[PDB]
Design an enzyme around this catalytic site. Structure first.
Site: not given
Ligand code: NA
Ligand code: NA
Ligand code: NA
Ligand code: NA
Ligand code: NA
Ligand code: NA
Lengths: 251, 251
Positions: B8, B10, B93, B95, B165, B171, B211
């Site tokens: 990905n 992104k 996703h 995001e 995920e 974060g 990750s």
């Protein structure tokens, strides 16, 4: 002000083959008078549009993100667009504000980032049915424009075009008249004059972004504060050239 | 199950020139073992990726809309993607669920439309920090998967890949362990077995989408329920091939 017509394909056509056929049609159209023509298309067709579209017209994105790049899966950014030589984006279309939930703060940040990065923008605004029915259109539209204004860097108003969409006349059972379009474009021009000054207000193109077809474009174009069109479905049709050519009736 | 690695990109890279350099790098990578490799990129780079990427790998969109075409300014649709010969899309996703506010009902409709139209999907899920801290991960993830399940037409589970995920580790100041990844992939497999049956559960690839780097891919790949990866930032780097090649440590 140079008459301005943007053709918004929206999420159309379904295929690259149809997009190419459409480009070939636009390439053969005879333009009359003087008019700035921009064509907006889905991200996926933008490379072929940039490659093949007639050089006297300009390509536009239909949206961009607020950032140069990063962890924003699904989003396209200004640098990507610019790496193709593409100079324009639409921002704040009603369909995005409504369906995709884009708010004024999001859109202000897009306008600021876009202009700070050399882009030209077509920034959309317009009121919904309840504000139209309440006679509160100007107030609603002024608040949108007042959010936009601080995003525009000094010396960038030459790279800004504003499109008025009568959202109250989109899927509501209500239709907009030619006088409605003139009135709201004038409302916007006056808000600009009051807030940023007459010189800017006198130069910014303000477009009618309601329903524009070969059967109403000449009367709309003739309204004094209507400087062109952000065209929906007719941009996919040979009638788009009638609309481009309506510029000869605008003065 | 054939090990599966999706790269990905992104919203990267910034330019078509960089995308082309990256494609040339991927084209020269020597793959070891047996692995299904898919590469997802911004809409604007998808044509060049489809044209130039090595034919033994497949291109993917990073998102699509719910409809074939229409008044959805800024959106790209399945038919557009398919008109390029593109066979995959990512959906859901984190995001997009977070930043772009995509909800489960939106995503379910996308999955249904995509699969009914011949697409293969990488459907993303995963819990946030409070559900991880509360020990309620499985419940949160089960609810997501339970929303996805009714979208899958009969005979289409072969066209479905699920990516977990650990959003709680994105974060937040918290990191995911190799055991965390195994545990949640197994949670998903078990939810599938309970809801749609062991035959389907035994065939669906479930990917770790936290990750993934050259320094952790071999240990992750070796977890029994981890069938591959949806790779973030390393997909832009020569380390992506280490990750693709981690398949030899999965059994
Ligand atoms: Na009033
Ligand atoms: Na300027
Ligand atoms: Na006019
Ligand atoms: Na628990
Ligand atoms: Na099948
Ligand atoms: Na494994």
């Amino acid at each position: 002000r140079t008459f301005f017509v943007g053709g918004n394909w929206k999420a159309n056509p379904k295929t690259v083959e149809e997009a190419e056929k459409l480009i070939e049609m636009l390439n053969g159209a005879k333009v009359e008078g003087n008019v700035e023509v921009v064509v907006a298309a889905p991200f996926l067709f933008l490379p072929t549009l940039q490659q093949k579209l007639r050089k006297d017209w300009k390509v536009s994105a239909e949206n961009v993100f607020t950032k140069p790049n990063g962890a924003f899966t699904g989003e396209v950014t200004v640098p990507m667009i610019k790496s193709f030589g593409i100079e324009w984006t639409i921002l704040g279309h009603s369909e995005r504000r409504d369906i995709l939930k884009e708010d004024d703060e999001f859109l202000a940040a897009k306008a600021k980032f876009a202009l700070e990065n050399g882009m030209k923008i077509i920034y959309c605004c317009g009121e919904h049915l309840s504000e139209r029915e309440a006679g509160k259109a100007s107030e609603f539209v002024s608040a949108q424009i007042e959010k936009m204004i601080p995003a525009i860097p000094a010396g960038k108003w030459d790279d800004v075009v504003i499109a008025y969409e009568p959202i109250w006349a989109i899927g509501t059972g209500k239709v907009a008249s030619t006088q409605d379009a003139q009135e709201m474009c004038k409302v916007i021009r006056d808000i600009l004059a009051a807030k940023v000054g007459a010189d800017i207000a006198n130069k910014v193109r303000i477009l009618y972004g309601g329903s524009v077809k070969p059967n109403n474009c000449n009367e709309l174009a003739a309204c004094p504060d209507v400087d062109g069109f952000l065209v929906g479905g007719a941009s996919l049709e040979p009638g788009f050239i009638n609309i481009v050519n309506s510029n000869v009736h605008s003065k």
